[PDB]
Amino acid sequence: AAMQIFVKTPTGKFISLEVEPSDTIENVKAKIQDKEGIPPDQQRLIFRQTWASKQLEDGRTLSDYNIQKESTLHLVLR
């Protein structure tokens, strides 16, 4: 089940995360904190698809957004 996804920071740096589809958005924000030191309350995560630009919210899973292996999330400071 384990898979790699990427987060693009505002700098343009690509973070690599190890996740599972069942991981919560809060847990993803925690993993981003572990690596970048950005507190989760300041993180805005966007999943840019060809038909939607969805903001990932606490209480959902990566699976809720159909995040795929090697997907990229955009991180915005806000």
Partner: protein
């Protein structure tokens, strides 16, 4: 007795500006004059399809308050309404529209109406695939079925199409083909600015192979890195209502101007990928110091005539006025048959 309450023709209803909300009123007028969508709400088809538990939805509140606004605008009891209740829900679920760009609000409403009305109540997680050498019809059909397994709504029915995406890694030359849904198209305009361009040329630009910018690389699985691949899009399947956004804000921000090209777009019979489209609505943008002003042209479904909507004011229009440099978002409806 009541400002705005006047017996009027249904749909000929303006929207008060709440303070820089004309970007929202213009979008609403385009959606209001999308006949399959308005008819769906006025006939109360939405009540059975509200999705209150959708983890990507707005608890049904975007669809509910949109439906209530549409019912006011098409009741016949108003010359304009003040969409406070709708604007409150938009700000609640998309606070970026508080204190804007008409297109970005449209994208949000198309997304929010879709999820609030999504017929899939328990979505399966689906690993999406690329072509892997299979014929285009096979891969496209699989992609549409995968889309429908998670996304099945009046918004999908009306607005969602498919294009074929071909990505080529510049380093390993691997080719990756996917079929990807969309709910509107953003068309580039020629750079440097030309004074006149047909809409078909901007569509041609859209389907031209372009190297991805260094700010939007694509992960190559072979190289195990993000690469500046080239991306080529082909319009594969076109929806009954095609929303066409003209990318007028193509200048770097310091220029503080837009591409004011006269884009000549058809009123009747825009032909694309074997489909024939007719214009039903236009969002206009007029330049101005504080982000400018948005208005709309739209064809009324009950009398077939064109009208101009400027916030609370509604007036008759002619189609000869509609192609102007102010045109920004175009709504096209597919013709049933042709020839």
């Amino acid at each position: 007795s009541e400002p705005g309450r006047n017996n009027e023709q249904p749909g000929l209803c303006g929207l008060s500006n709440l303070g820089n909300t004309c970007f929202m009123n213009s979008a609403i007028q385009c959606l209001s004059n999308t006949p399959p969508l308005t008819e769906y709400f006025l006939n109360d088809k939405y009540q059975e399809e509200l999705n209150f538990d959708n983890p990507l939805g707005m608890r049904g509140e975007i669809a509910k308050s949109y439906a209530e606004l549409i019912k006011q605008m098409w009741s016949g009891k108003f010359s304009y309404v003040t969409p406070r209740a709708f604007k409150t829900q938009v700000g609640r679920f998309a606070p970026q529209f508080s204190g804007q760009d008409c297109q970005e609000l449209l994208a949000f409403l198309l997304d929010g109406l879709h999820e609030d009305l999504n017929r899939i109540r328990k979505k399966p997680y689906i690993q999406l695939k690329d072509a892997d050498g299979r014929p285009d019809k096979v891969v496209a059909e699989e992609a549409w079925e995968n889309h429908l397994k998670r996304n099945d709504s009046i918004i999908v029915d009306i607005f969602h199409g498919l294009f074929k995406s071909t990505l080529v890694c510049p380093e390993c030359a691997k080719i990756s083909v996917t079929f990807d849904p969309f709910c509107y198209l953003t068309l580039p305009l020629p750079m440097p600015k030309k004074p006149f361009v047909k809409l078909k040329d901007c569509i041609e630009l859209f389907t031209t192979k372009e190297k991805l910018g260094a700010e939007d690389p694509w992960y190559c699985p072979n190289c195990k890195e993000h690469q500046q691949a080239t991306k080529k899009l082909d319009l594969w399947s076109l929806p009954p209502v095609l929303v066409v956004h003209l990318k007028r804000f193509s200048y770097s921000r310091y220029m503080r101007d837009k591409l004011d090209t006269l884009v000549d777009f058809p009123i009747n019979d825009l032909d694309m990928s074997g489909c024939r489209y007719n214009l039903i609505a236009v969002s206009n943008h007029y330049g101005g110091m504080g982000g400018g002003h948005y208005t709309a042209f739209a064809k009324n479904k009950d009398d077939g005539k064109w009208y101009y909507f400027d916030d609370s004011s509604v007036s008759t229009a002619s189609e000869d006025q509609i192609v102007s440099k102010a045109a920004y978002v175009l709504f096209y409806q597919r013709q049933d048959s042709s020839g």
